[PDB]
């Protein structure tokens, strides 16, 4: 029966009916009439539903009709939108493409998405997908989110810094703009903390997994998990008669590249009887071609009936948003690396830490997408209940708040110490944040955003970097500095397959500038530009082609940003004595707090906090510079300062006058060196 599409006046196309049948069978569908009533009755809703419950695709579409019905019989009023946020760029796209099909309209027209570096809207857009940061990016110009009627903060469980900020402001919005609906969705079953936070808003629970999963435990507690994991993989390969791939969760590349090798050894021992096992590493910095393996199908198996299998060994990248098809065996050792930023010593850590009562589920939930499946945890069930905490900390309780305080100040939060965070940041961290901003001239001593500060918020950057870049425009080096900004705002472009480490390091040496990693990246960026951006040249020189193409994009965006505020892009003459001098000075302008000096003991100690550090062995330095500017204080096996740079102490006193003011300093070696320099300059 001919229904007309209300959006384009078309008959609904022949494709839609078939899709319609399948989507009617999604679990959320029965709730359709029930949801609308709640939305009509309340301003805030909390919604919960397991993976595969169809929330993300059906709920925003049902929001759209509810907008339309509210326009029916009113005049056609000012164009308002329904927003759906999505924590990751890849998800914001993959939803929209499906949802532009379901509503039988052309993507970007009535149904769109708005992610970084690509806007797919039109003036007929009603339903806008965006990453979380973009809905944070819009508010900073329009605090009441003025274009929006129904918001939808999806995947709330991920608790990302974009999302935690939003929620608080959006509850603030729920005051004031007293017409805007909010529908907070979470995919995890979470203990209704969302329900409290938003004034006891109604909680809607929707079930909906695809298949059931079997959970398993070791009865005793194995003492060497990698030996256990490797041993577990072999055991499964040999005993399980069901076809399927094994997805093993490890901590990182030092292990996922070991585990591949050692598992290859034992399958080479098991010889002709056992089926072929193919071991595929998978971590977030593998180049595109190495990632693409995961789509590869299994062998046709050996003739004797021995099942051949693919074994994907992966960090938490396989837990969320990456959907590995064909998995029917998940091995979960129960660890992940967790950043935790220790605001007392500015040591940002990367230790192996136990997963949470949620994360355990999500790892197991990979099985049960295509057929029933089994999850093997290498820990004991009593271990599960009593050591793993119930959910993993939000991002906000874990990271440096420099980027966030500046965003909140631009949004016109003055009252940060009462800001309504769902899980508030530590007092000690915020005191680093304000202290970070106060040196940087972002905020005056009475805490208002200064003129320089308001410009610093406009850049998609961290506060230190923005101070560098702005200051680079008065040193006549902004074109060179713009690139050293772009490369440091993307995940690091060095590739090092451990099967090829020596050859890859040789490529790194050829790029290496003498004065440290910051000029080494500018050399890397220029070399990529000279070679017409040819993917091959990225490969043989062990540079991720994703990072550079992302990086060059970031640079173009920052140029556009500079132009809108009349920061002239300039260069010093390459012929000039000042060219590599003006680059290093600009760095020092903005990472002036994060500077080390070489004490007589042969170790570095970081300026003022006396924290003992070593050059991170990836540095292309071949010397210990006496004063070292560094971008990231890392805990792994030791404190390591990464991305290390030689600076000259005269720059420190001239360029960054506030912090290196001698009279404040803790009395020690750092002060002794600095004092002599100031007397010399005078």
């Amino acid at each position: 029966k001919i229904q007309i599409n209300p959006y384009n006046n078309q008959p609904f196309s022949n494709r839609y009916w078939a899709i319609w049948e399948k989507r009617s069978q999604l679990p959320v569908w029965e709730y359709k009439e029930k949801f609308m009533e709640l939305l009509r009755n309340n301003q805030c809703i909390t919604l919960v539903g397991e993976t595969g419950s169809g929330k993300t695709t059906q709920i925003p579409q049902w929001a759209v009709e509810f907008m339309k019905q509210q326009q029916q019989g009113q005049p056609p009023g000012q164009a308002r939108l329904v927003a759906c946020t999505q924590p990751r760029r890849v998800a914001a796209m993959s939803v929209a493409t499906r949802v532009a099909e379901e509503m039988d309209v052309v993507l970007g027209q009535e149904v769109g998405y708005s992610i970084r570096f690509e806007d797919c809207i039109s003036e007929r857009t009603v339903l806008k997908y965006c990453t979380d940061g973009m809905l944070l990016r819009e508010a900073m110009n329009s605090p009441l989110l003025d274009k929006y009627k129904v918001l939808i903060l999806d995947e709330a469980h991920e608790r990302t810094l974009a999302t935690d900020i939003l929620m608080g402001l959006i509850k603030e919005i729920v005051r004031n703009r007293a017409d805007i609906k909010v529908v907070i969705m979470s995919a995890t079953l979470d203990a209704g903390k969302f329900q409290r936070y938003f004034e006891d808003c109604p909680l809607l629970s929707v079930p909906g997994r695809t298949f059931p999963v079997e959970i398993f435990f070791t009865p005793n507690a194995e003492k060497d998990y990698l030996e256990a994991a490797i041993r577990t993989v072999i055991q499964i390969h040999m005993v399980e008669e069901v076809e399927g791939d094994i997805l093993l969760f490890l901590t990182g590349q030092e292990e996922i590249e070991e585990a591949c090798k050692r598992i290859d050894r034992e399958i080479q021992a098991l010889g002709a009887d056992a089926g072929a096992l193919s071991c595929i590493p998978l971590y977030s910095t593998l180049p595109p071609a190495a990632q693409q393996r995961i789509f590869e199908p299994a062998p046709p198996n050996r003739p004797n009936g021995a099942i051949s299998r693919k074994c994907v060994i992966s960090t938490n990248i396989a837990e969320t948003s990456l959907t590995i098809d064909g998995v029917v065996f998940v091995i979960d050792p129960g660890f992940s690396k967790q950043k935790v930023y220790n605001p007392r010593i500015r040591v940002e850590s990367l230790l192996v830490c136990p997963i949470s009562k949620a994360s355990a589920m999500q790892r197991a939930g990979r099985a049960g997408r295509t057929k029933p499946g089994k999850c093997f945890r290498l820990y004991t069930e009593t271990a599960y209940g009593s050591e793993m905490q119930d959910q993993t900390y939000p991002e906000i309780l874990r990271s440096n708040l420099g980027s966030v305080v500046l965003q909140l100040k631009k949004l016109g939060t003055e009252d940060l110490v009462h800001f309504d965070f769902m899980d508030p940041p530590a007092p000690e961290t915020l005191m680093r944040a304000l202290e970070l901003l106060n040196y940087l001239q972002a905020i005056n001593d009475d805490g208002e955003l200064t003129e320089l500060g308001s410009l610093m918020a406009e850049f998609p950057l961290d506060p230190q970097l923005a101070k560098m870049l702005i200051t680079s425009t008065e040193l006549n080096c902004s074109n060179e500095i713009l690139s050293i900004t772009a490369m440091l705002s993307v995940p690091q472009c060095w590739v090092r397959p451990n099967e090829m480490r020596t050859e890859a390091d040789e490529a790194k040496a050829r790029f290496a500038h003498i004065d440290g990693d910051h000029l080494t990246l500018l050399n890397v960026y220029h070399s990529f530009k000279q070679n017409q951006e040819d993917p091959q040249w990225c490969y043989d020189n062990f540079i991720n082609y994703r990072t550079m193409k992302t990086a060059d994009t970031v640079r173009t965006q920052l140029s556009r940003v500079m132009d809108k505020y009349n920061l002239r892009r300039v260069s010093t003459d390459f012929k000039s004595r000042d060219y590599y001098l003006n680059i290093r000075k600009a760095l020092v302008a903005g990472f002036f707090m994060q500077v080390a000096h070489l004490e007589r003991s042969g170790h570095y100690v970081t300026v003022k906090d006396n924290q003992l550090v070593n050059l991170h062995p990836s540095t292309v330095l071949d010397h210990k510079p006496e004063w070292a500017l560094y971008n990231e204080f890392v805990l792994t096996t030791k404190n390591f300062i990464r991305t290390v740079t030689d600076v000259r102490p005269e720059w420190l006193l001239q360029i960054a006058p506030q912090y290196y003011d001698l009279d404040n300093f803790p009395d020690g070696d750092t002060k002794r060196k600095l004092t002599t320099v100031m007397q010399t300059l005078q």
Binding site: L598, G602, D622, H623, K624, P625, E626
Partner: protein
């Protein structure tokens, strides 16, 4: 003494048990350590660098 000799014999046997994978690995560990040869030096002559 019967308790102690039973334990000591067992621990003698358990060390002797699979005395090859450790030895072959420890031989392997030593071999690859020597062949890796030159580690990077990263000298410290800061007054030359000045």
């Amino acid at each position: 003494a019967s308790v102690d000799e039973e334990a000591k014999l067992k621990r003698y046997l358990e060390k002797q048990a699979r005395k090859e994978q450790e030895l072959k690995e420890k031989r392997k560990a030593k071999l690859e350590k020597l062949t890796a040869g030159p580690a990077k030096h990263m000298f410290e002559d800061q007054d030359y660098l000045s």
